[PDB]
Design a protein around this nucleic acid. Structure first.
Ligand SMILES: [K+]
Ligand SMILES: [K+]
Ligand SMILES: [K+]
Ligand SMILES: [K+]
Ligand SMILES: [K+]
Ligand SMILES: [K+]
Ligand SMILES: [Mg+2]
Ligand SMILES: [Mg+2]
Ligand SMILES: [Mg+2]
Ligand SMILES: [Mg+2]
Ligand SMILES: [Mg+2]
Lengths: 56, 178, 173, 153, 214
RNA sequence: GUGGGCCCCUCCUGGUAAGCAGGACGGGCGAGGCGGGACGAUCCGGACGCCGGGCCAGGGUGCGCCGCCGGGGCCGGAACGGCGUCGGCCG
């Protein structure tokens, strides 16, 4: 009629069993959420740099 | 009792062998494995590993991509452990020396009529078994349509399309669409 | 089994304390490791210096001459299941270490107090006129005689191997 | 629990320190920040706009975005078997410049400084964890003799 | 080939070095104890003491098994390389290692060994880790080939480095597989040595403890 | 495949309490052979291929039933009573 409600008894062991993972190396440098005005200026400067540009 | 659990991981399984029923593949594999054993030469090592792949890990290479890749190093021998196909959208082909598992008939005719050579891997293993002035090349392993559906379309950071046909709108018109 | 050690120790020196003081104690211990542990016990409780904050300078071990029988009076404190108490005991032994074994066995037997339950304040030799307990001062006299207090023990011990015999042995007294 | 509003369980951590109520001092706005810098998160309970959730109080992170009014901070947060890189937007009253690499910059500068200053032999520059102490001499001309005392009760 | 010649010349030079180092090392081993005796006598002629050097190396023996261990304890033991109940290792002394080992005292007994204990352990029970393999240490041919970079060419060089805790202590120590000793004799596995039990710091009694196990 | 768990050690909540009911880090049984705790899924040791030799953990050593001697003492349960016996502290 009544069963158990809650435990976290085995959960820290399950959490450790494969090691604690780390997020990908490129999420630290994702542009997402940065200022768009800064991102615009970045694109202009590289686009007009003759050593950095990739225009054909 | 001994504790061999902490600080140690589960061992790993990789293909140490091709599972093709093809005698040509088996013979080329044993031969290049011997050459590796006796000379070192990570070139022969990588070639021996590549001859064991599973044909979704061995995409094709086209003559046009090869010409672009071998530009301004036209004197080197391109080595491809896969099939070379043709590209009719390239009107003129340059002269190249290519070695491949298989050639298509139209690719062979275009390469020869340009003036280049079509080699096999036994030809390669006779003239040069350790890859001096050879370049190993491969195609786009993630060009398959199957690998474009892996994931969770519906999760807000997916960028992957669903699988069948979906005629509705719920969750398909962006965020704030559920 | 007890052995006599003198332990010298001190606080580890700092800028306010060029040459801190030196403390020495006499310890009765089964061996050197227990002796230094007990020195750190006392100098922690009394001079507020833990093992972490100081260094033991030496643990000298002393051997002692025997061959003559002396009186030792031992002033101690122990702990029971209702509190703590002070006690005096006197023993007749040859050396201080042996006297301290006798004390420890008698506490284990009659008080059921163990070794780490007991702190020894004083141990000193007591002159014959100076004695104050009967079971000691009895034997501090000239011409003490008694018949053997347990001569059955020899007979039983021999029987342990002479399991069967042809008569019940006597007990000579 | 039975209730988990945004500011549940904040009776003490968000309260202001004794005799430290009122407006913040103006270094809070005269400090200069840069991309890539390290910061600690500490919630000031008098300033309500751009105030991070309670989980982020007492953590250290790196600036990813410099904005007109708020800063963007990346925090590694453990979730149930993995680490996640969380990104938050926090106003100036809740951030302080962190000193987590101060010691490292000091040591790098000192290493190069002593290499330049070399005395002809180059000293060992690796940190050495406390060794066992060497042999030496102590006088014992003035020992103090102590003993256990008697129980007094 | 050139291999037989070079092999023989190498071995000959190693042997010459072996005798040289043996006699010098014996001299040094003799002469320390006189040094400290004279220092104590100079101390005693004043009202002064001599305080000698503290232990730089420990010998460490596991004494409890693998059922029921806690995570931090078993991580510390794994890094100590103590995975089986009667295994033993040498260890360096500094604040990091000492503070790690105090956490697992109730699983271990440890102390500071003599040069005689070190010699007996290596000569009776010496095996080497080579390419992940456990290879018997029976001659000086296999120490020169592995440890010559670090200027250790003989068994007596290995003994001397492990006793003095020298510059290549890490490499000399990790070259040895953990020692696989016979089963121990105990009083009270669940009590400290300073309470009459057997785990923990036992000082210079580790030598008698492991003599019967070597 | 699983989404009925349970027990121990420490820390807690309701209840007079419960081999009662509800939570927490770590460990165990579940899904762990062997020896010991007379007897017990979980306690004390130790966690396992088939054998021969040796060393011995936990518990013990009158006979059942494998294994001992020497030495120093004494001779389930509450409030509350005892000039039983041995030891102390204060006057
Ligand atoms: K789908
Ligand atoms: K969460
Ligand atoms: K009730
Ligand atoms: K199991
Ligand atoms: K189990
Ligand atoms: K009584
Ligand atoms: Mg995980
Ligand atoms: Mg083994
Ligand atoms: Mg129940
Ligand atoms: Mg049974
Ligand atoms: Mg029998």
């Amino acid at each position: 009629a009544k069963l158990k409600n809650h435990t976290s008894k085995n959960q820290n062991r399950k959490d450790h069993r494969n090691g604690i993972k780390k997020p990908k190396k490129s999420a630290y440098t994702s542009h997402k959420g940065m200022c768009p005005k800064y991102l615009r200026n970045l694109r202009r400067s590289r686009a007009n740099d003759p050593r950095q540009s990739l225009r054909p | 009792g001994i504790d061999l659990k902490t600080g140690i991981k589960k061992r790993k399984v990789e293909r140490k062998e091709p599972k093709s029923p093809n005698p040509y593949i088996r013979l080329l594999h044993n031969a290049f494995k011997v050459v590796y054993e006796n000379t070192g030469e990570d070139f022969t090592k990588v070639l021996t590993k590549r001859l064991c792949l599973s044909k979704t890990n061995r995409p094709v290479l086209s003559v046009s991509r090869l010409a672009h890749l071998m530009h301004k190093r036209e004197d080197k021998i391109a080595v491809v452990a896969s099939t070379v196909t043709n590209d009719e959208r390239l009107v003129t082909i340059p002269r190249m020396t290519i070695c491949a598992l298989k050639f298509s008939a139209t690719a062979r005719s275009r390469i020869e009529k340009a003036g280049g050579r079509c080699m096999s891997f036994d030809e390669l293993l006779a003239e040069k078994p350790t890859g001096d002035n050879c370049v190993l090349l491969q195609g786009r392993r993630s060009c398959r349509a199957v690998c474009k559906k892996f994931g969770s379309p519906g999760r807000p950071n997916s960028h992957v399309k669903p699988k069948g046909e979906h005629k509705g709108r719920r969750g398909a018109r962006g965020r704030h669409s559920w | 089994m007890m052995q006599k050690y003198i332990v010298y120790g001190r606080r580890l020196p700092s800028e306010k304390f060029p040459e801190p003081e030196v403390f020495r104690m006499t310890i009765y211990a089964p061996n050197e490791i227990v002796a230094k542990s007990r020195f750190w016990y006392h100098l922690k409780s009394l001079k507020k210096i833990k093992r972490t904050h100081g260094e033991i300078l030496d643990c000298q071990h002393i051997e002692e001459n025997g061959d003559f029988v002396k009186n030792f009076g031992v002033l101690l404190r122990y702990r029971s299941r209702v509190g703590q108490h002070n006690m005096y005991r006197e023993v007749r032994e040859t050396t201080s270490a042996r006297a301290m074994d006798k004390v420890y066995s008698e506490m284990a037997g009659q008080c059921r107090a163990r070794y780490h339950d007991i702190q020894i304040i004083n141990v000193k030799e007591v002159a014959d006129e100076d004695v104050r307990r009967e079971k000691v001062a009895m034997f501090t006299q000239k011409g003490v005689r008694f018949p053997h207090p347990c001569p059955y023990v020899h007979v039983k011990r021999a029987a342990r191997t002479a399991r069967f015999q042809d008569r019940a042995p006597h007990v000579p007294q | 629990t039975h209730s988990q509003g945004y500011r549940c369980k904040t009776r003490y951590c968000f309260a202001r320190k004794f005799r430290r109520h009122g407006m913040a001092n103006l270094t809070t706005y005269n400090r200069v920040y840069k991309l890539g810098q390290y910061v600690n998160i500490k919630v000031n309970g008098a300033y309500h706009k751009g105030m991070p959730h309670r989980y982020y109080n007492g953590r250290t992170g790196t600036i990813f975005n410099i904005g007109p009014r708020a800063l963007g901070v990346q925090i590694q947060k453990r979730v149930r078997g993995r680490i996640m890189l969380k990104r938050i937007n926090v106003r100036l009253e809740h951030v302080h410049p962190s000193d987590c690499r101060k010691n490292h910059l000091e040591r790098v500068a000192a290493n190069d400084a002593a290499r330049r200053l070399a005395g002809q032999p180059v000293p060992c520059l690796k940190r050495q964890n406390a060794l066992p102490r060497a042999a030496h001499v102590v006088s014992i001309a003035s020992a103090i003799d102590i003993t256990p005392l008697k129980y007094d009760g | 080939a050139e291999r037989a010649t070079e092999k023989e010349k190498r071995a000959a030079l190693v042997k010459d070095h072996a005798v040289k180092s043996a006699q010098v090392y014996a001299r040094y081993y003799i002469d320390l104890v006189e040094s400290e005796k004279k220092a104590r006598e100079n101390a005693l002629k004043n009202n002064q003491l001599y305080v000698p050097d503290e232990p730089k190396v420990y010998l460490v023996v596991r004494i409890r098994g693998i059922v029921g261990v806690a995570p931090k304890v078993r991580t510390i033991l794994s890094l100590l390389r103590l995975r089986q109940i009667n295994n033993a290792v040498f260890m360096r002394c500094n604040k990091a290692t000492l503070n790690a080992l105090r956490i697992v005292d109730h699983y271990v007994t440890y102390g500071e060994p003599t040069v005689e204990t070190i010699r007996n352990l290596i000569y009776k029970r010496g095996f080497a880790k080579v390419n992940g393999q456990r290879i018997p240490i029976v001659d000086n041919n296999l120490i020169d080939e592995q440890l010559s970079k670090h200027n250790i060419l003989c068994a007596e060089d290995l003994v001397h480095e492990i006793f003095t805790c020298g510059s290549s202590f890490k490499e000399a120590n990790n070259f040895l597989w953990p020692f696989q000793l016979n089963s121990a004799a105990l009083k009270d596995k669940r009590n400290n040595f300073a309470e009459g039990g057997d785990f923990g710091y036992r000082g210079k009694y580790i030598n008698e403890f492991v003599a019967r196990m070597i």
